[PDB]
Symmetry: C3
Subunit: 529 residues, 3 copies
C-alpha cells in the first residue's frame, strides 16, 4: 500500500526569486509604436511572470470620453521575446488577451473600473476628463505554465522583449467633440516591464517545448483560409472579427463600465427613446424630411403599418402633445420589400414628462431590441446598400454618437453572441480532418477551458512540461502539411443590417517549438516530430 | 537535491483526439421519452467529454412563458452508458446537474440568458414567444476526471448512451393562457450527442475504478431512509425536495432571468403590491367577500390589529381615495390562534399614482417578506388545512399566476436557504456512524467542494485514477451492509404555511465500481473490498 | 513512451474520515474573550479542515444595526493550535481572513447575506432587529494544503485550539440609538469547533514543514518596521491599516450588503443629497451658523466660488423655494488656502419633490465623489487640524451617522483602492533586498494569487508537502538576520482630509517551522537552515 498521509520530502534546488523592473525604450519612427525592454541582469539563471505596466496621462479638454475595459491588454498589438535577433516566443495582442480572460483579478489589473470606463465629460479646455492612472497587463507566457519548471533559462544571453502597440484610439471611446488626434499625437508611451528572475545554484538547462500561436487573417468577407507549413499543431482556433474602419467605427451608444449584453441593449434603447418620443407644442422640427413623426392618439396606440406601439406619457402640459418617431432607423436592400425598422421593435413605452428638465423620464419600455441591433454601426445604417435614408435621428442625437475601435472584438456584435458561422470544414492535406454543421467545437472549447466564444479544435490533452506535447503531425509523403479551413455564413434576414457589417476570418494555429540552451537560446520549429 | 527548474520529459502515448457527433433516436412509446445514441466508431480506442445538444423549437401563440435556467440539464431525468445491454455508468439528472453547477461557462451553455429565462408574452396566435435556440448539457462523467487517464476504453464494443427526459413542462414557467399541453404534444425531441474520441496506438486497457451515484427517494413526508447492499460508498448525501404536484405548482410570481434570493422576493413583493394598494373612487370591488379592504386615513397609517402600515401615495386625483388590502394572503390551522398575514409583513409603502396608466408606480416598500413566503404555492395558501379563505386577491392578480415544475429544487424554498432538517443520524448496520444536531455536514460539503446546499458525508479523500478510491466498507459478519438515515424536521411556527409544503427525503450514495476490459466492457460493483 | 491512458493504481493506506464537533469553553476574565476547544478523541491519528461555528443571538430593541460582511471571520482576533502548552500553529484573524477571501462559497458561509448585512431598524424595545443566525469560519491551516498528506498527526497528544475574539462591536454597524454596549455585555459566546479526523491504520508520522505568519504592527503613522530573528521566510507582506479608535469610527454612511465601490459612493451620495437640497417656504433653519445655504435661481445654476451646480427639482409647490447647501463638509489646514468642499463635488442635481413624504426623490446626480471621500470619518472632518467648522449638516442628518469598527480594513478607504504607499525598501541585514517606486509587488501578489490588495514579496515557488519549502535564508556571519521595511507615503493634496486619517503599518513575515512527531507534537522554528 502507498501512503497518502506521509511522504519523504525532497530538498529542492537552491534558488532565490527576485522582482526585476526595466524601463522601456520607445521607438515612434515606424507606423506602429514599439517599446523595447532589455533583460540586463546577469546574476539570474531563469525568468518568468512578465508584467507590462503602462502609465496613462491625465486627459484634459472638452468632449466626452471613456476607456474601453482592459486598457493594458487592448494597447498591445504584438509581444516578442528575442535572444540576439532570434525570436524565442511571440504572440499577438488578441491571443494574449484571450489567454488571460479567465483570471478576474489579473484582468482587473489591466484597468476595469467606473472611473476608467464610464463616459466622462469635459466642458472647458482645463476640465479633467480622466485622471492619470497606471494599468498592468500580465503577459502570460508558456514559461509560467508550471512555475519554476517552465521558466525561460538564461545563460549569458541578451534577452530582449519588444512590445508593438495599437493606436491609442483603439483603447478609447469618444464623441465628436473630443480631440482624440491631439492626445494621440502627444501621448507619452511611458511603460515598464516587470518579471520574476531566479538566482539558481547549479542550473543545467534541459531542452523544453513551448507552443507559439500563429495567426492568419483573411481578406474582408473571405470564408477560406490556408495555413501552410503545419507540422506540429496543438490546437486550431477559428473565429470572425468585425472590420470597424472609418465611418464604421461610429456607434449610437456604448454602455461604458457596465459590459453585460443587457447593459449594451439598455444604453442603445435609452439613446433611441431620447429621440423616438417627443413632447412639443407643434410638429417637431429639425428631423430629416424622410422622418415620419405622428401624433399619439388619445387611446395611446400608434399603428406603424401592422404593428402597434402603446405610448403613455404622464404629466404632459396642457398645450403640449406627444409625438412618436415611426422610422427612426430603417434598412432595406430593395424597394417594396420588408423594412428593418427600429421603431417597430417597441410595443409599449411609458414615462413621465419633467417640466424642470424639459425631457421625458422613461419608466418602462417593452421592446425586442437585441445586441445585434445595438452593434450595428451608423455607417451600415447609412451605407449605399440602404435604399432608404437610414438615419432619421435629429442632429443632437446624431451628435451624441460615439467612436469605438476596440481591437479584440469577435463576431459581429459587441458580446459575440450571434454566431455568423454555420458550417466549418477543416482539411489536412487532401483529406477532411473535421467537419461540423453547428458550433460543436465552440461548446468543446468552452468545456475544455479554451478561448471563450470561438471554435477550437484541441489536439493536445497531454500534461505540460513533464511530457512532450501531443500535436497534429504532418505526413509529407501524403502531402499532409497544410490546413485549409472553409466556413459558411449563417443565414440571416436580407433586410437585417447586421448581415452587411464587414467581417474578417481569423485562424489561429498553436505550433510546437523546441527550446534548446546548448548554444544560447534557440527556438526550433518542430518538424516531422 | 531534486530539481524544480529542469525535468527529463517523457514521450506520451501516440494518440489523436477527434470530435464526434451522433444523432439521437427518439422513443416516445413509454411514459418517459428516451433518446438513444449509438457509438458507431471502430477506429477510436478511448472516449470522454460527453455533451448533449438539444434543439429548442420556436414557441408561438398567446400567453406568457419563460424557460427555467439551465434548460439542457433540467430536461434530463436519467443518463445511462451501456455496453451490450450492460450498464457501464448511469446517473440521475439531478446528480449530473449538481456535479456541473460549479462551472459557470458550462452552465451558461445549458441556456441561461435574458432571451431564454425572462417572461415573454404572446398576444396573437402568430406571435413568437420564444425564438428557436440550441442548448448544451455537458454530461460530466468519471471518464473526464483525469483527462486521457480516466477515459472509457473501447475494444470492439457497442457502447450506447440512453437519455431519459423529464416532461417538457418541467423546463417551462407559464401562465394559465399559455397552451403548454399542445406544445408538449408537438415538441420535436431533436438532440445530438457529442464526445471526444481518441485514436490510440498500442493501447492496453487496465482495470479502473469509477463511482456511480445511487439515488433513493422516500415517500412523501417520510423522515427515514434505508439503503441496502452498501459495500463501498465514497460519499453519502441527504437533502429534502419539494413535491410540486398539481395545484402545488401554481405560484404567485417567478423572477425569470434574475435568480438571486432578493430577485425572488422582489418579484413576489411587486406582485403583492399590485393588489394590496388600490386607488379608486368608491370602495374597491371584485375581491372575495372575506377580503378586508380599508381606506387609508389622512395620517397615512393603517392599523392591522397591533401592526401599523404607513401608506403614502403621491398624485392621487382629487375625487379618488387610497385603499389598503389588510388580509391579502392569510393562513392558520386553528381558529382564534395567531394568523400568518402577508399584509402585516409591510411596514411602509410609498409610491406615485400614474394617470396615464391608471396604476401606482411604487418607489419604496419596507417589508419583512422572505424567500419562504415567496416560495409558498397557491395550493398551500388555499389548502383544506387553512381555516381561512387563504387567497383574497382579485381575479386579475390570480390570473397573473405562474406554473413552475423545476425538477431540481431542493429544500422547501426556491433558493434552498431555509433548512428543514434539524438533526441527522446515520447508522451503518446496528451502530451509529454519524450524528449531528446542526448542519455540520452541509458546511463540510461547502468547504470540500461537494454538492452545494446539501448535507454530505465524504469518505474518500484519496486522489483519483492513480489510487484506488477509499470508501466506507461493509463488514457482513457484524451486519454492516446497510445505511439507515433518520432526520428530524426543523421547528417552524405552526401558522407558517411553509411547514405544510409537501417534501420528499432524498439519499444519494456514491458507490465504487470496477471497470474491466478483459472481455468487453464490464462494470462490477465492488463487494466486500 | 510513458502511457497517458492507463496507469497501475496503488492501494492507499487504510483510513476512515469522520466529522468531529467539540464544544467551546468560554473565558471572559481577561481583556479579550477566549474560547478553548479540547481535541478529546484518542482513536483518530490525523486531523485537518477546522471549522468554527458561531451562534448569533436574536437582536431586539430600538435603533438601527447591521452586521459587517463575513461575521464569523471578523469575530476572530487570533487562533492558536497547541499541544501540551506548546504552539503547533497560530495566526491572526486578519491573516486567516486574507487567506480565505478567494473562496466565495466559504466566505458566504461566514455570514454574507441581505438579512444579516443590510441595515435593520427597531422602533420598540420588543422589535426584532436581527433574527438569530449561525455562521461558520473555515479555519484554513497548512494541514489542508495537500488533503491527507498535510494532515496534523496525533500520537496520544492533547491538542487544544484557542480562539481569541475581537469585541462584538467590531462585527456591527449601528447608529447612536442602538444599545451596542448592553448587547456586548449580554452576548453569549456559544461556539463549536468542527474538524475531520482520520482513523488511520499503521500510520508512521514523518517530519513536516509548515509556515506560520508573524505579524508586526508599527506605531501610528510610523513608516519603518524591523523584524528580528528572520531565518526562513517564504513571503513578506506589507500594507497599511486605518486606526479608528473613538470618534474616528463614526461615518456618514455604510452601504450594508452591497459592498462594491460604487455602492459605498452611492450610499454616501444619498446621505449627502438628503441634506444638501432643501425645499422650504422660508430660509432653512437648524443648520449651524457657518452653513452657507443659498436659494436656487430660476436658471437653476448655483455658483460656489468658480464652481457651478445645476439644480432642477420638479413639482415644487407654489409657495416653496429650493435651497442648496454650498458647504456641507469642508476641510482645510490653513486659512485662505484651497478648501476641500464636498458640495463642490456636484455638477448637476435633478429630482422631483414628493408632497406625500415631504421629501425629494432624486433621479440623477452628476458628481465627482470618490471612495476616499466616502471613507473619511466624521472625526477627521471635525478634527482640530481643520481650520473650518467641518460638519455643517443638520442635527437629523448627523443623527443618521453610523459607527464602524471593522477589524480587517486595509489602506485608508473602505475598498483599499487608494494606495498610500509610494516607495518601499526592504533591507535584509545591511544590504538592500528589494526596492520599488510603484506597486510592482502588489501586481505580483495579484498575479500569484496572494493576499489581495497588499504588497507581497514571494520567496517560495516550490510545491508544498512534497518538497521542503524554499525561503529567504539568514546568514548570521554577514549579519543577515533581520528585515527592515521602509515606506514613503504617497503624495496627497494638503487640503484632502484623507491625508489625516490615522494609519498603522503592518508587516507580515511567513516563517518556516519544522513539525516533528518523535516525542509528542513539537514545532521548531527553522533557524539557519
Amino acid at each position: 500500500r502507498a501512503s497518502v498521509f506521509a511522504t519523504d520530502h525532497r530538498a529542492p534546488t537552491v534558488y532565490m526569486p527576485q522582482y526585476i523592473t526595466t524601463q522601456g525604450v520607445v521607438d515612434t519612427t515606424s507606423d506602429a509604436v514599439t517599446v523595447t525592454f532589455e533583460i540586463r541582469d546577469k546574476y539570474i539563471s531563469a525568468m518568468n511572470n512578465f508584467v507590462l505596466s503602462v502609465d496613462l496621462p491625465e486627459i484634459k479638454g472638452v468632449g466626452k470620453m471613456c476607456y474601453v475595459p482592459y486598457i493594458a491588454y487592448k494597447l498591445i498589438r504584438h509581444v516578442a521575446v528575442n535572444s540576439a535577433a532570434d525570436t524565442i516566443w511571440e504572440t499577438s495582442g488578441e491571443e494574449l488577451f484571450d489567454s488571460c480572460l479567465d483570471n478576474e483579478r489579473v484582468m482587473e489589473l489591466s484597468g476595469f473600473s467606473r472611473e476608467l470606463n464610464d463616459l466622462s465629460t469635459g466642458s472647458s479646455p482645463n476640465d479633467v476628463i480622466k485622471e492619470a492612472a497606471c494599468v498592468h497587463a500580465y503577459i502570460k507566457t508558456p514559461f509560467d505554465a508550471d512555475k519554476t519548471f517552465s521558466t525561460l533559462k538564461l545563460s549569458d544571453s541578451k534577452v530582449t522583449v519588444t512590445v508593438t502597440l495599437n493606436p491609442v484610439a483603439c483603447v478609447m471611446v469618444y464623441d465628436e467633440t473630443f480631440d482624440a488626434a491631439k492626445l494621440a499625437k502627444e501621448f507619452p508611451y511611458s511603460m515598464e516591464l516587470s518579471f520574476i528572475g531566479y538566482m539558481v545554484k547549479n542550473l543545467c538547462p534541459r531542452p523544453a517545448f513551448i507552443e507559439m500561436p500563429r495567426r492568419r487573417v483573411e481578406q474582408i468577407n473571405h470564408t477560406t483560409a490556408v495555413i501552410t507549413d503545419v507540422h506540429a499543431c496543438t490546437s486550431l482556433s477559428v473565429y470572425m472579427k468585425p472590420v470597424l474602419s472609418d465611418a464604421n467605427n461610429r456607434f449610437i451608444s456604448y454602455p461604458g463600465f457596465q459590459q453585460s449584453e443587457g447593459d449594451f441593449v439598455m444604453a442603445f434603447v435609452e439613446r433611441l427613446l431620447e429621440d423616438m418620443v417627443i413632447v412639443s407644442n407643434c410638429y417637431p422640427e429639425g428631423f430629416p424630411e424622410t422622418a415620419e413623426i405622428v401624433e399619439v392618439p388619445p387611446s395611446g396606440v400608434v399603428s406603424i403599418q401592422d404593428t402597434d406601439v402603446f405610448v403613455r406619457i404622464d404629466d404632459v402640459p396642457v398645450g403640449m402633445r406627444v409625438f412618436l418617431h415611426t422610422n427612426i432607423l430603417v434598412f432595406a436592400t430593395r424597394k417594396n420589400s420588408v423594412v428593418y425598422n427600429m421603431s417597430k421593435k417597441f410595443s409599449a413605452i411609458t414615462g413621465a414628462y419633467s417640466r424642470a428638465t424639459s425631457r421625458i423620464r422613461f419608466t418602462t419600455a417593452i421592446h425586442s431590441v437585441n445586441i445585434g441591433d445595438a452593434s450595428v454601426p451608423v455607417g451600415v445604417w447609412t451605407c449605399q446598400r440602404n435604399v432608404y435614408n437610414g438615419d432619421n435621428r435629429s442632429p443632437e442625437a446624431r451628435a451624441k454618437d460615439l467612436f469605438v475601435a476596440d481591437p479584440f472584438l469577435k463576431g459581429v456584435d459587441f458580446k459575440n453572441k450571434i454566431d455568423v458561422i454555420a458550417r466549418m470544414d477543416v482539411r489536412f492535406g487532401n483529406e477532411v480532418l473535421y467537419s461540423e454543421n453547428s458550433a460543436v467545437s465552440r461548446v468543446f472549447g468552452e468545456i475544455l477551458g479554451k478561448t471563450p466564444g470561438v471554435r477550437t479544435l484541441q489536439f493536445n490533452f497531454t500534461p505540460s512540461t513533464f511530457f512532450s506535447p501531443t500535436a497534429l503531425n504532418s505526413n509529407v509523403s501524403r502531402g499532409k502539411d497544410k490546413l485549409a479551413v472553409r466556413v459558411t455564413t449563417a443565414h440571416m434576414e436580407a433586410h437585417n443590417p447586421l448581415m452587411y457589417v464587414p467581417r474578417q476570418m481569423v485562424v489561429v494555429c498553436n505550433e510546437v517549438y523546441r527550446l534548446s540552451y546548448d548554444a544560447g537560446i534557440v527556438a526550433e520549429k518542430v518538424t516531422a516530430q
